[PDB]
Design a binder for this molecule. Structure first.
Ligand SMILES: [Mg+2]
Ligand SMILES: [Mg+2]
Ligand SMILES: [Mg+2]
Ligand SMILES: [Mg+2]
Ligand SMILES: [Mg+2]
Length: 61
RNA sequence: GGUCAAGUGAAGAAGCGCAUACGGUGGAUGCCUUGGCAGUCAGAGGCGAUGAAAGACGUGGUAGCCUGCGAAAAGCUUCGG
């Protein structure tokens, strides 16, 4: 999720973008706990998405 | 071919010694180096309340330790190769 596409939004709909990833990061950890996870790379990929949204969310001022 | 007497006296090693040939233990010697020591020529001579030097705990798809990072956590954004 490139930061270039992230600057096209506003703080109002970037904050829901961050909430959407927290669902996704949570759901992936519930699958990992039960052992029924097949897309293992998605754990480290979702972590990077939240960090990038929080990066752009700090630049608006 | 006998009987007797006198004399003489090889081998026979429980274990051991020396020599030699093969092993075992052990780690020397030789050769080697990703580690040190001592100079010369430069650098820049401080870091810290914008939180230092030194750490604890966490951070990975899976157990530990080291090396990096800090709930944005072996990384996030922009430039340049
Ligand atoms: Mg020998
Ligand atoms: Mg000098
Ligand atoms: Mg460590
Ligand atoms: Mg934060
Ligand atoms: Mg580039």
């Amino acid at each position: 999720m490139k930061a270039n596409e992230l600057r096209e939004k506003s703080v109002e709909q970037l904050n829901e973008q961050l909430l959407g990833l927290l669902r996704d990061q949570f759901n992936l950890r519930m699958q990992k706990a039960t052992g029924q996870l097949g897309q293992s790379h998605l754990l480290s990929q979702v972590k990077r998405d939240i960090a990038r949204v929080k990066t752009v969310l700090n630049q608006q001022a």
